[PDB]
Amino acid sequence: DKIAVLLGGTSAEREVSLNSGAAVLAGLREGGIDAYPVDPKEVDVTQLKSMGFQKVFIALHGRGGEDGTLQGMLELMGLPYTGSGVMASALSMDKLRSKLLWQGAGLPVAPWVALTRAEFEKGLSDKQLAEISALGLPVIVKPSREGSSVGMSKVVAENALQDALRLAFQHDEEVLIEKWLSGPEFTVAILGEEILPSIRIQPSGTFYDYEAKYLSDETQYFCPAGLEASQEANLQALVLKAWTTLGCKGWGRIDVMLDSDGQFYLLEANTSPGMTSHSLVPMAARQAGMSFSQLVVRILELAD
Amino acid sequence: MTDKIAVLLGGTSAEREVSLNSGAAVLAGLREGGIDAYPVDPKEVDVTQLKSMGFQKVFIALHGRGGEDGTLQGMLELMGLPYTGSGVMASALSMDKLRSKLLWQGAGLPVAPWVALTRAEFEKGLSDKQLAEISALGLPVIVKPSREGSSVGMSKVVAENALQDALRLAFQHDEEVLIEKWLSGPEFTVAILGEEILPSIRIQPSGTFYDYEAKYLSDETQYFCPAGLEASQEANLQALVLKAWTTLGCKGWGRIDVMLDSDGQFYLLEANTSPGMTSHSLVPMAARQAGMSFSQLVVRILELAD
Amino acid sequence: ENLYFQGA
Ligand SMILES: Nc1ncnc2c1ncn2[C@@H]1O[C@H](COP(=O)(O)OP(=O)(O)O)[C@@H](O)[C@H]1O
Ligand SMILES: Nc1ncnc2c1ncn2[C@@H]1O[C@H](COP(=O)(O)OP(=O)(O)O)[C@@H](O)[C@H]1O
Ligand SMILES: N[C@@H]1CON=C1OP(=O)(O)O
Ligand SMILES: N[C@@H]1CON=C1OP(=O)(O)O
Ligand SMILES: [Mg+2]
Ligand SMILES: [Mg+2]
Ligand SMILES: [Mg+2]
Ligand SMILES: [Mg+2]
């Protein structure tokens, strides 16, 4: 079979995606698969089956490639594709609705307030200001539907919030204000029915931002995560429940942080994770005894 | 040389026959409004070809998976064709009753107590914790597939020993099923059109619940619009429905189903992002009470598209 | 194409 490896696209994470797709391609060609890079910014994707491919590997990040739109197109084109279906992809991109779903399911999530742009440009009511104040300081402000820490700022003073919302609202119509979690920070990869070894992330700097993710050499990673056996077990159980509640499939990565109470809190699910080498999914597969090439082969194998 | 509109109807879901009827009425209604609309059935026509066929915009009159669950919306977004109703995420969520319920509960909105089961769990055999949770709902219960419509796959369980039969039926239609506390009713439905909440409708089936026969075939189902609620009860219902619609991220138009229970409280059942549009359907009924003919309604739904 | 509304 001929494989298309979708890379680049038109989101804020285009540059990361170009690097993931480059790495996925090579690992796939090293595995004996007939794979070829296709960039949706360059190539009309609606033409894939007419171009001669019969399976797709999605190495796109962000809205378009990760939010169910592509998965819907591909489902109707017929073509099997890597990762989560339409619902779980769309839901996993929307951090507000992920949070609501997990809270509904009794899962641990950081206290938060959500705001729309219409609510912001009008001005905040006393009800909303009271809710925001009960979060304490500091808080994090993030767009609901971004990735790679885009549009995020940490606010440490109450009068600095309205400015941080202005930045976030340049990226989304819906914004989250969340309680600042102490850390430490972890990420857990999923592959089929297998939860892979957790990774602890220690950024130099305020949080795990875009620079810390892709540009800097100062970020420290620990695989395995160095947790006590009971804590590692609790982390894995929590991630499994989070994954299944969202309805995710195939592979992915869920972000989790400890807070000051010594408990884990779910941040988000990523359904088309980074695949450079700076990247965390390949690192966990390696620890489990898989080469990068073996990982991408397996991800392709679990499709519809 | 104005816009050519495709009315998608029929398709391959369990609700194909209802959708043929919805599309038939929508087609005539749009033409009555001066819109150059044509029927396209995805069962017979490759919808990946709509743009190449010369269509500019799409009225979705499909019901069920394949038309209402975000898959089609996804395709149309990449094709760059504007379409009616909710986008990819809200369509996918509204189709999934299990995840609609979780989201609504996360938002502090009222939902019937329930237990969810996967097909794997049912086949493994129900645990003692599961039988306990199910028993706590009391009897009767209602059993539904997570992702159907038109009461397909649903039934009422009146004896413990027949729960298995209701589950086997629902599992013929989905890989995830819900068992819900029985709500006393009465039953209502509330249509949404753009930023307007339309008059609620009280629904009174002649039989056990509002099943496929009561919805589409019986002349004994009774409807009341207006619903006969006291002014503040009506306001409360409309406020609940708006919050449920906004929580799911829905847009354009739709219809949310709600029931009272013995405690005097309203409980959300589900949202429908591509509701019935037969002549006798409930969205047209609510729009009629609000002063709109059927043609004025479909023209408005189309105007709301992207 | 032959249309339901001819012209436009
Ligand atoms: N509530 C929080 N408290 C502290 N740090 C946070 C919080 N939420 C996010 N972060 C930091 O921001 C980074 C990105 O946030 P995340 O929710 O994973 O969004 P993204 O999709 O941008 O990765 C996290 O990896 C973490 O370093
Ligand atoms: N918990 C419940 N208790 C009593 N009747 C219910 C309950 N849930 C649904 N019903 C009945 O079943 C019908 C269909 O259920 P609903 O959840 O609306 O699914 P559908 O998508 O098939 O319409 C309702 O219109 C109502 O008559
Ligand atoms: N979405 C980015 C791209 O690859 N992996 C990601 O994870 P995130 O930075 O969103 O946690
Ligand atoms: N899905 C059907 C067809 O159109 N309207 C509907 O509502 P439901 O029967 O799902 O409550
Ligand atoms: Mg992310
Ligand atoms: Mg993250
Ligand atoms: Mg329904
Ligand atoms: Mg219903």
Residue numbers in the entry:
A (entry chain B): 3 to 306
B (entry chain A): 1 to 306
C (entry chain C): 1 to 8
Could you give the paper's own sentences about this structure?
Ddl enzymes present an attractive target for further chemotherapeutic investigation because of their essential and universal role in bacterial cell-wall peptidoglycan biosynthesis, which has been a validated target for antibiotics since the discovery of penicillin. Ddls, which belong to the ATP grasp superfamily, use ATP to activate a single D-alanine substrate. The resulting dipeptide is then incorporated onto the tripeptide chain of the peptidoglycan by the next enzyme in the cytoplasmic phase of the peptidoglycan biosynthetic pathway.
Weighted difference maps at 1.65 Å resolution revealed the surprising discovery that phosphorylated DCS was bound in the high-affinity D-alanine binding site (D-Ala1), with the γ-5′-phosphoryl moiety of ATP having been transferred to the 3-oxygen of DCS. Continuous strong electron density extended from the DCS oxygen into the phosphoryl group, which was then linked by two magnesium ions to the product ADP. The DCSP moiety mimics the structure of D-alanyl phosphate, which is an obligatory intermediate formed by phosphoryl transfer during the first stage of catalysis, prior to condensation with the C-terminal D-Ala of the D-Ala-D-Ala product of DdlB. DCSP exploits most of the interactions that generate the high affinity site for the first D-Ala substrate (D-Ala1). The amino group of DCSP forms a strong hydrogen bond with the carboxylate group of Glu-15, mimicking the critical interaction made by the α-amino group of D-Ala in the first subsite. The ring oxygen (position 1) of DCSP is hydrogen bonded to the backbone NH of Gly-276, in the oxyanion pocket of DdlB, while the adjacent non-protonated ring nitrogen, which occupies the position of the peptide oxygen of the dipeptide D-Ala-D-Ala product mimics the bifurcated interactions with Gly-276 NH and Arg-255 NH1 made by this atom in the product complex. Our results reveal the presence of phosphorylated DCS and ADP in both active sites within a dimer.
